[model samples]
Target: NKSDAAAKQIKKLEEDFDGRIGVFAIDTGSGNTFGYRSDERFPLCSSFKGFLAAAVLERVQQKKLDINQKVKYESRDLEYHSPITTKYKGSGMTLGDMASAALQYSDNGATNIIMERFLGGPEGMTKFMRSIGDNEFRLDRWELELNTAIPGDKRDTSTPKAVANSLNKLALGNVLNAKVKAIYQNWLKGNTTGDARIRASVPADWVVGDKTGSCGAYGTANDYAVIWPKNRAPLIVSIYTTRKSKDDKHSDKTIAEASRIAIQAID
Candidate 1:
C-alpha cells in the first residue's frame, strides 16, 4: 500500500531533519497517510492565500462575486517587499490577474487587494475564515506584513494536518466549482517563490501547487503544497520551522534541504 511506502519515507525524513521538521502527507485516492509533527500548528504566512483563495471561490460559487470581474488599484496601492508589488509598474489590473499575481509571485498588494475584494476588508477575511471552519488559523495577529512589521506570537497557528484536510476538500471536488478550482490550480502552478522548505526538493517537471511563508532575521519559514506526480495520486504536505538563525545567503539551500528531506521521506 502507499501508506507503507510513505511511512518508510517519513522515517527517513525525521532522521534527516534531526526531528526539527513537521510534515503531513496523504495519497487522496487510497486514503493512505503519514506524518511526523503533523499536529503542530505553525504560522500560515502566504500559505493563508490558500484560505483566501477558498473563501473567494466560496463567494463566487455563492454568486457573491465574479471571478472575471475587474478590481482597480494604483501601483501605489501595492504593498512593499514583494516581487509583483515592486515589479509591476501598471496603474490598474483585473481580479483574475491579481489572484494570479498573488499566487504566482506571492504579491502582498495583490493578496491584500484580493482579500479586500472578497472579504470586503480585513475583517471580511476574518469572517471568511470563520465560514470555512478554519477557526484555529488566526489572521489578526499574523497579517501579511513581510518587512516593516513585527513578528507575531508563535501561539497563533494551524497544523499541517489541518492544512492537509483543507486541501483534501479541494481535491475531492466539493468545496468550490470547477472554474474556481481551475483558478486555484493555475495559482498553484504559478507559485514562483520556492525559497521555503518544500518546493526546493521536488523534481522540476513534477506538478506542484504550493505557497511559502518566511520571516527575515527570525528564521521562521513554512511551505504547504499539493503534489500531483504524473501517474500517481495527489499528496498534500506542509513543513514549518522557527527560531533558527536567518541565513539570507542560504535561503534556497535551507528550503531545498528541508524539501528534499520530505520528498525522500515520502517517496
Candidate 2:
C-alpha cells in the first residue's frame, strides 16, 4: 500500500532501461516495504562475496575458524578479475584480509580461496545461507563460471526479498556478535566498486555500504546495500536487473535511479 507509488516508478524505470528490474526495500524504523518482482530469481554474480564474508565471520564467531590465520595461495587459485588476491598470491594474507578483499574489491581469487579452504565450496556456502534462514539463495558454481547467468537457469541465483532479508540479518540483526559485526560493517563500508549503484542514490552524510555484481552477458548485474540515515534506523535495499538481449550492457545509472525511487518511498 505505502509502496504503490514507488512500485509504479520502478516499472517505468525498468522499461526505460530496456531491462527487467527487481527491487526490495525494508525500513527498520517504520517497517515500510516495497518490491517489484522481489520473489523472482536474479544472478548473484559477485554479490555472493558479501554473504561469503558473512559466513566466514559466522565461523569465527562459532570458534570454528580463526580470522587472523595467515596462509599463502598458489597462482593457480587466482581467477580473472582478481584485483586484490592476485597481488598477494606469492606472499600470504589472513582469513580476515581475504574476506575484506572479496567484499571490498570483488576479488574472485580471494573468493574461491575462501570457499575452498574456509567455507568448503559452493555447496558449503549455500549450506551456510540455509543455516542462516535464507532458503532462496543458491551458489552452484565458482567465479567466472557462475557469472554465466543464463536467462532461464536457476543456478547461482536469489530473490531480491530473500537477499535483502538475509543481508538485514547479517548487517543489522543478530547474526554476528558486536565485535565481529563491527568488523563486517567496516569491510562493507570500504567497498570500492559500488559507488555508482545504491550508493549514488543515498545522501552525502548517510552511512552507506554495498556489494555489487556484474555479469556481462544477458545484461545481468545487481547491487544490495545497508543505508543508515543520521536520524533514523538503517534500511536494507537490493536492486537487480537483466535484459533479454545477450549483449545488452548492465546499467549502473538505472539501478541508481531505481534506488532513489525506492528510498524516497520509505524514508
Candidate 3:
C-alpha cells in the first residue's frame, strides 16, 4: 500500500494551502492506494452529484427509467449556475442530457432535478447515501437553496475517501450495467471546470474526470476527480477546503498551491 506516501502528500498540501484539506486516492484497477483523513466528512458540494448520477444510471440499467425520456424544466428546477438554464429558457431536455450537463458543467439545476426525480426528492438523497455506505453524508434541507443560503450548517458531507469508494463502485460496474457505466464515464470525461486542484496537478494528456465546487464569498472550494493516466492504473483524488479569504483570485491560487503539493507527493 502507498499509505505512507499519501499521508506525506496530504501533509504537504495542508502546509501549502494553510487550511483543512482532505485527500483520497485509490488504484481502481488493482486496489492499491493511499489517503489522509479519507473517511472524514467534508462538504461534498456538487460532488455529491457524482453518486446521484450513479444511482440514476443504476435505475436506467434496471429499466426503471428511460434515459432518453424528455423532461421539462420549470423555473424552480432552474437553479442558477450554468448559462444553459437561462439560455435554454423553456426548452426541454432528456434525462441523459441533464445527466450529461450535471457532469460536464456541474450544473446545479440539472443536479437538483436529477436528485428530485431519481432519489424521490430531497429526503431520498439522504437515504441513497446511506444505502451506498455513506451514512455520514446527509442533506438537511429541501433543495439546492439550502446549499446556497447556509452551506456549512445545512449539509453533512464526505471526504475523498468516501467519494473514492463511490467511484470505485462505478468502475467495478457494481452500481450500474456496463453500458450505463460507459455513458457516465463519457460525461465525466467532458468535465469543464479545470481551474482547481486535481486539474492543476495532473498532466493535460491524462484522462481526468472531475467535478469542482465553488461558493462565492463563503470561501468553500473543493474538487474531486478520477485520474486515468495512459498505461497507469486509475486513481481517485478528492480535495475539499474552506479557506478564510474573501478574495476569489487568492483562494484559487491557494487551491492551486495545494494541488501542486499533492501532485508532488504522487510524482
Candidate 4:
C-alpha cells in the first residue's frame, strides 16, 4: 500500500498545482517505498550541498584530509551567492566551518570552498556521489555558475529515489560510522535556511532532521528529511518540484501541502 499511497498523493499534487512534482518515501524497517517522478533527474539547487558534506566527512574519516585544516579564499570566491562567506570575506575558514556554512546557510562561497579546497570540484564531488551509489545524482556546474547556464545544463540534479537512498543510508547508519555521520546530522539540525515546507507542516509531535533548497527564479523547491515519530520507526521523505509560477511561494506551498498530504495518509 505504500506504493499505492504514494501514487495517490502524487496524483493530488499534480491536480492541485501547475508544475512537475516528484515525491518519495521509504520505511526503513518494513522496506516499503513510494515514488512519483522519483525516477526523473531534476536539479538539486542547493540540496546537493548535503552530498558534498558527506564527501568531505568521508575524506576526513579516511585520513585523506583534516577537518581542522584551514583554506584560503580570494575575493572572487566570496563574490558568489553566499551569506556566510560574504560575511567572512578575506578571512579563510576551516573545513568544518566551511561545511557548516555550506549546509546551514546554503552559502555558495562555502560550497565552492568545500568543492575546490576539499573535493576536486564538480567532477570530484560527482565521483564521490557516484562512489557512494547515488547513481542518479550529477553535478554539472558551480553554484553561482548555474544562474547563467542555459536550459538543460543550468543546474546539478538528482531523482527523488536517489536522494532518498542517500538519506536512507544516513538514517539507517548503513554508510558512515557513527562519529563521522554525526557531523552531517549536527549540521542538518542547524540548517539556517527556510523550512516553510515539510518541516513546518509535519506533526508537532514528530521531530525532523532535514535539508531544504529553493531556486525561486527557476520555480524549484526541494527537501529531504527523516521524520521521527515517538515510539515509531523513522520515515524517510524526499520532495522535489519545478513550478511555472516564476517564484518560490507557489513551489514552497506545494511541497508543504504535498508533504502534509503524504504524512496524513500514513498517520
Candidate 5:
C-alpha cells in the first residue's frame, strides 16, 4: 500500500512552494521505503558530479584508471564556478583530487576534465549507471549547459528514486569495493554546499554524506544523501525540485522541509 499520509503531506508542501518536488527515501536496514514523484524527471544540475566521482572509483577498482594519475589543464579549461580547479590550472592535479573537488565543491572544471579524459563525457556516465543497474538516470550534456534546467526537458535529468537507489548502492551497499568506497564516502561527507538542504533537517547527531546541485534556472536544484542515525542502520534520501518560472530561485527551505517530512515518513 502507498504511504498516503506522507505522500499527501509532501504534495501539500509542493503546492506551498509553487514548484514540483520529488522525494525518495529508503531505510536501508529495514527496507522500508517512501516516495513522492520519485519517478518524475528533474534536472540533475551538479548532483551528477557525485556519481561522476563514483564512476571514477569504479574505474580505479577495475584497474582501468589510476587515482594518482596527474592531469594538467590550462586557463582556457576553466569553466564557470570552478574555484578549486581554477587554483590548480597549469600546475595540474591528481585524478583523485579532481574527482573529489568535483564532488565536494561541485567544481565545474574538475568535473569536465574527469569527463573528457576519463569517463568519456555524458554518455560514459550514463553507461556507468546502467552497468550498476540504474536505468532511470541520464546525463545528456556537460556543466553550465546541463544546468539550463528548462521546464519539461528530460536532458541531463534523473528521477528521485534512481538517485536514491544509486546512492544507496554506492554509499551503503557493494556497488563500490572497500577502499574506493571509503574514499567516496569521505568525499561526500566533506561536501561543502548542502548545509541548508537536507543537512538542515536532520538531527545534529546524525552522520550525513551528501551531494547538492543547483541549476539557478527554473528553480531547479537537488540533494541526495546517506544519513546514519545513531545506533541504527543508515537511511538514503534524494530530493529534487523545479518550478514553472524560468528565472525562479530554488528554495533551500522547501528542500529542508521536504527532507524533514520524508524522514518522518520512514522513521
Candidate 6:
C-alpha cells in the first residue's frame, strides 16, 4: 500500500510539475529508495557546495590547510553570484569566512576560495571530489566561469541519484570524519535561498538541512537535502529541473509535492 500510494503521488504530480523533474529520495533506516530519472545528468548549480564544504573540512582534518589564516582577493579570485562576498569590505577572507560564504549564502567568491586557493582550481576540486568517493558528479569550473565568455560546459553536472547518495552520506556522517561532519552538519542547517522549493511544503516541526543552487544563466533550480522526521529516520531528497522555459521558482510545487510523497514511502 505504501508503494502504491507513493507511485500514485508521483503520477499525480506529473501534471503540475513545471519543466522536467528528477527526484531521488532514500530511507536510510529502511533501505528504501524512490527515484525518477535517477540516471539523468544535469547541472546542479550550487547544490554541490556542501560536498565542497566537506572537502574543505577534510583538508583541515588532514593538516594540509589552515582555514584560520587570512588570504587576499584579487582580480582572478573575484567572482560573481556571491551575496555573502558583495557586502564584506575585504580584499579576501580566511578559509572559515569563505566556507561560510559557500555553505551559508551560496557565495561564488567563497566557492572560488575553495576552488582556486584551497582545492588548487577546477582540476584540484575534481581530484578532491573523486578522492572522497563522489562518483556521480565532477567540478568543472569555478562559479565565475559558469556563464563567462567561453561559458561553463553543460557536462559540469551530477545525477539525481548521485546527489541522493551524497545527501545520505552527509546525514549519516559518512561524507566526513565525525567531528568535521558535525561541523558540516551544523553548516547544513543554514536558512538557504531554496526554501521556495522543497522546504516550502514540509511541516514546520520537521528540521531540514540542505544546500540549494540556482543556475540563473540556464534557468535550473537544484536542491539536495536531508529531511528529519521526528518519529522516523532521516530521508535524503534531491530534486533537479530540466526545461528551457522553467526557472527555480517553477519547480517549487513539484519538489514540495514530491517531498510529501517521498515521506509516505517510508514514514
lDDT computed for candidate 2: 0.91
TM-score of model 2 vs. true structure: 0.97
Residue 75 in candidate 6 has what lDDT?
50
Better of 1 and 3 by TM-score: 3
Q: Could you give candidate 5's per-residue lDDT for residues 1-267 as a string of tens digits?
A: 248888998889889878899999999888989899999999999999999999999999999989999888865658889989999887889989999999999999999988988998999999999998999999999888998998878999999999999999888889888888999999999999999999999988898999999999998889999998999999999999998799789999999999998888887
TM-score of each: 0.79, 0.97, 0.84, 0.89, 0.97, 0.86
- Residue-level lDDT of model 2, residues 1-267, one tens digit each, is 558878888888888868799999999999988888999999999999999999999999999989999868865747888888878878789999999999999998889888998898999999999998999999999987999978899999999999999999999989899999999999999999998999999888999989999988899999999998998899999999998889899999999998998888876
Candidate 3: segments with Cα more than 4 A from true spot: 1-9, 15-17, 74-77, 148-154, 245-250, 253-267
Q: What RMSD does each model have against the real structure?
A: 4.0, 1.1, 3.1, 2.4, 1.2, 3.2
Report model 6's TM-score to 2 decimal places: 0.86
The candidate 6 region of ten consecutive residues with least summed lDDT is 144-153
Per-residue lDDT for 159-181 in model 4, tens only? 88899998878655656788888
Local accuracy of candidate 6 as per-residue lDDT tens digits, 1-267: 777667666766654543556778888788888877768777777776777787788888888878686766655445667777666635667777778678878887788767866877777766776765668787676675542211234556878888888667655756567887777777887747767766775777888888887676535667888877778787788887654442334466666777667666755
Taken over the whole model, the C-alpha lDDT of each candidate is: 0.63, 0.91, 0.66, 0.76, 0.92, 0.71
Candidate 4 accuracy as TM-score: 0.89
Residue-level lDDT of model 3, residues 54-140, one tens digit each, is 777777888989998977775663667854545554777888887777777777777777777676865787777677676566666
Q: Which residue pairs show backbone clashes in model 5? A: none
lDDT: the better of candidates 4 and 5? 5
Count: clashes, candidate 1: 1
Candidate 2: which pairs clash?
none
Question: Which sections of candidate 6 miss by over 4 Å?
Answer: 4-8, 11-18, 74-77, 147-154, 246-249
Native-referenced Cα lDDT, model 6 = 0.71
